Design a protein around this ligand. Structure first.
Ligand SMILES: O=c1[nH]c(=O)c2[nH]c(=S)[nH]c2[nH]1
Ligand SMILES: O=c1[nH]c(=O)c2[nH]c(=S)[nH]c2[nH]1
Ligand SMILES: O=c1[nH]c(=O)c2[nH]c(=S)[nH]c2[nH]1
Ligand SMILES: O=c1[nH]c(=O)c2[nH]c(=S)[nH]c2[nH]1
Ligand SMILES: O=c1[nH]c(=O)c2[nH]c(=S)[nH]c2[nH]1
Ligand SMILES: O=c1[nH]c(=O)c2[nH]c(=S)[nH]c2[nH]1
Ligand SMILES: O=c1[nH]c(=O)c2[nH]c(=S)[nH]c2[nH]1
Ligand SMILES: O=c1[nH]c(=O)c2[nH]c(=S)[nH]c2[nH]1
Ligand code: NA
Ligand code: NA
Ligand code: NA
Ligand code: NA
Lengths: 295, 295, 295, 295
């Protein structure tokens, strides 16, 4: 036998950081969950019980906290690039570092219509994420994403004109509910190293804001022919608004809301134009994916 | 043997309802999860295989949807009272109906600074709940609550002066992080029946807004001596602002954020006034409860 | 305002203990999750910021580990009684201690048909639980339970003869699937204190084994008229086999498996006696409860 | 813009099937969760609102149930190959079908030491899975796996000799607890189509049994130098026992159990050889991966 691929590290590392402005007295908090997996000349730890090549996962954890102490943790594209660069520079035998960051929401509270200097709310489980792959000799590859953005529109979605054969029972519709959990990922141009990532730092928060804004406005305003056609519109707009990204990927479930025929009970009309009460369906669900690139 | 207590029904019934204003073109959505458990002269279904006394759970489900078609589903205190009243009136042998409602958030979207007529976002997993117990001969007992309201303050929490003995290792602190998931419940005066519940309908949304506002402002502004002392302040203020509630109950976890001593690494100072990076702890957690009534 | 009820403590405390027999070389492991909530003369911590009455939750955590070091952790009825007794004896102002224990499964592995001396498997998420309430002046109240025992029978369940009215659509059946997650609780006679609990220690594991065996055999062998009638049989048998318990409580969901009519496709017959492929339903679910006592 | 990749279909489709032997009266149940994603000449559904190319996801769901009615659902490698082959043969414009199957455990009950003909238990959340990729022109690619197999050994694990530098605080150990959730995947030789998959059908259950047996016995018997070294041993043994698989992949978390120093309390000794009570850690966790192929 032979090792064909190997990586190891620390997952589910919870990290909080606070920034304090003691001129203004305003505090700002950041919370994330970090994973770091390393690759390199490590196969003998698997084949020969040679632990000399292992940077212990506990030491990887220590390194996350130390790096967070010594650097800004935002934007996450930058923090992940600094962290991954550390590992491949510090350790001659480590040749790639793979950093995932899940960013959790702590939105400043407004109290009596003024922002509070040190109190925050989790306004939803939506996440902002990065995957930063630092590969020695080959730069830094970054994917950015938003996930867990759960939305619903009650009309201005349609689905008709689909293939119909002996497996088909679904009725065409010109007016349905559409609800989904948005997972949207933008893939950046390869960066040559940390310096280039630093040179683009303002584009990271700006591109996440553009992706979110395009998602929300397109979802709300598109009289949707299908999940596929709406998601494609979102992707092309994001590509047109940030030339340093190469592709945009969407993964959208179709979280179904079924009409309920009540006409068996006192003639009640609850279907079609009369549909008011629906049964949200936990499973199954459609799942629609696409990756959009430039022509 | 003998049956001492028995109840049965349908749980986890997902319900959506839409309201359409075709003068303004504005749609409004509501989504909940309902459970209904019935009690009455039903013991023979357990002891003698007598199913004649059972209102099938599927029929209970049908009844939830029909009631939702025929009535407003808001406020949930009203909807639960209508639903529970139906069961004890319709069925001579059913003497109590226990209705739980979990209300899910679908907040209208703002697009380009205007509210959208039919697009919504799940802005957090915070719930609004009711437990409505309709008991024949004895009125309607309602508990209202908010749950899953997750908050954090980065300073202006303290914990010192606690008991110290041979089991104690915890250091006193005059400046700590406080984070919790708020579960707050207000218990209404018994209502004599549906008419009385209807007569108070505006107080339900108003009291939920008061509880939420008091929670948020007290959490943000109290320089907290302990979780106990802060939660008590919230409860007394809610009681002073709604005379039709009898008690306020809080259940608050203390979701710990631990300092990380890094001085073992290049002398790094990250404790006390220098604390910037912390380790959020998933478990264990303090859990602090109280029920506050009037003197 | 006034405090009407208050309790505080530590939740979600994970605990492992190992026993090593260095005559036989056999090791045995135990893993649980513990919560302890205390009551007593503590209201001033809520109303007056008086932390002197608080046994810090961290010290409660320390106490769980110390008690686990100094005593057997099995059976959980005993461990919870020792722990709760400690708090009300150690602290004059603490008058009740409420201990919940969730016991996790670590079943010894068999390798090449022999039990392994120190390797274990989690053979399901079924739990064994206790709630032990130690109340000064009033003894020790113990509830024991098994939960998360998930079972299915593919036939020999029926449901017919139920009430039928204008809310009913469900078809009678003489042959259905029955699946549930069993939650079964037995409530012990009040114990006067720790000595009496100790005097009954072998009855705790024996009664849990009886409850489990009765559950499994009755579920498998009863040609069930309804969930209610089967669960009642289980409860009466457990009461007849342990005179020191006063009541048995069951809470059983009816996790539905729906037939799928495929006759629209090439005449396929998949209903009634021809039913082979079914759609398991995640929600909603029936929920059936009863508490059985002695006549 | 241009579509670079696209796939769509139905996820989270719950399926039960029963087999009845009415000579022996024995029933056997199978339960799974299925996902099917299709690829092909479908980009115009995204770019031009052309739904003519879409096989509706509801029809994909119908097709899963129909295929389950008409064929055995075991072994899952076979069922997934039949299902995926259907889509690329039925639809000229569909060129790949990607089928995931999660198989749930329903183990026959033993009652009074005899197997019961129609009653079953969920003996753990361990799953058996397949990913079957049917690609027109290019055969069938199958990955098989076991996941959620949670194990613990209380001794006969070590971790010493790892790299030590200014980021290292971890103490070497010659006797630790090792616990993990096993995710193990074997990748089969490409099959030319359904006929070849059928020709190997007995090897699927046999190879899953070999992988499980090798995992369990190696975990229990290896005096482990590290997670890496133990997992590698498992992989090489599986490769030596099934020549039709090309690689074996393991992904193992190191679910940490920390010693608890209690010597601050009455001199209690609970570390090193005296370690009996431990704190299981929910997060973070080491994560160790490797893919093993043949030399
Ligand atoms: O692409 C990745 N996504 C993740 O969410 C993740 N988590 C860990 S660990 N590695 C990775 N890689
Ligand atoms: O937008 C949709 N895309 C699909 O592929 C599909 N299939 C079914 S069913 N509804 C929908 N809706
Ligand atoms: O008090 C209750 N709370 C709940 O969340 C609930 N759910 C069901 S079912 N009954 C109840 N009762
Ligand atoms: O506010 C608090 N109440 C407590 O009872 C307690 N115990 C520990 S530890 N921290 C805290 N904080
Ligand atoms: O009766 C109880 N059951 C539990 O599961 C639990 N958990 C905590 S904390 N107290 C309690 N009390
Ligand atoms: O055993 C049952 N009890 C019930 O109350 C009920 N209701 C429906 S529907 N099925 C069942 N089955
Ligand atoms: O490789 C896969 N694994 C899965 O668990 C899965 N689920 C769906 S949908 N496709 C896939 N593909
Ligand atoms: O087996 C192990 N592999 C590792 O890479 C590692 N790191 C730490 S910490 N413990 C362990 N154990
Ligand atoms: Na390197
Ligand atoms: Na009645
Ligand atoms: Na006391
Ligand atoms: Na094809």
């Amino acid at each position: 036998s032979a090792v064909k691929a190997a990586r190891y590290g620390k997952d589910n590392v919870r990290v909080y950081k606070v920034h304090k402005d003691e001129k203004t007295g305003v505090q700002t908090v950041y919370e994330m969950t970090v994973c770091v997996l390393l690759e390199g000349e490590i196969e003998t730890s698997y084949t020969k019980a040679d632990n000399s090549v292992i940077v212990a996962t506990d030491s990887i954890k220590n390194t996350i906290y130390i790096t967070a102490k010594q650097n800004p943790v935002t934007p996450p594209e930058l923090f992940g690039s600094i962290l991954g660069t550390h590992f491949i520079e510090k350790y001659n035998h480590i040749h790639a570092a793979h950093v995932n960051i899940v960013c959790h929401r702590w939105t400043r509270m407004d109290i009596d219509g003024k922002p509070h200097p040190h109190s925050f709310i989790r306004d939803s489980e939506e996440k902002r994420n990065v995957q930063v792959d630092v590969v020695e000799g080959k730069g830094i590859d970054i994917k950015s994403s938003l996930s867990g953005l759960t939305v619903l529109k009650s009309t201005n979605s349609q689905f008709w004109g689909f293939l119909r054969d002996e497996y088909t029972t679904l009725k065409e519709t010109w007016d349905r509910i559409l609800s989904t959990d948005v997972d949207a990922t933008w893939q950046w141009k390869n960066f040559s190293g940390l310096q280039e990532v630093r040179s683009h730092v303002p584009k990271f928060d700006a591109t996440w804001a553009t992706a979110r804004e395009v998602t929300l406005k397109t979802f709300a305003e598109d009289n949707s022919a299908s999940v596929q056609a709406t998601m494609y519109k979102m992707a092309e707009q994001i590509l047109a608004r940030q030339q340093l990204i190469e592709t945009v990927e969407y993964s959208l479930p179709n979280k179904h809301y079924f009409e309920i025929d009540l006409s068996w009970h006192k003639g009640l009309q609850n279907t079609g134009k009369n549909a008011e009460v629906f049964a949200p369906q936990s499973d199954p669900n459609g799942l629609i994916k696409c990756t959009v690139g430039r022509s």
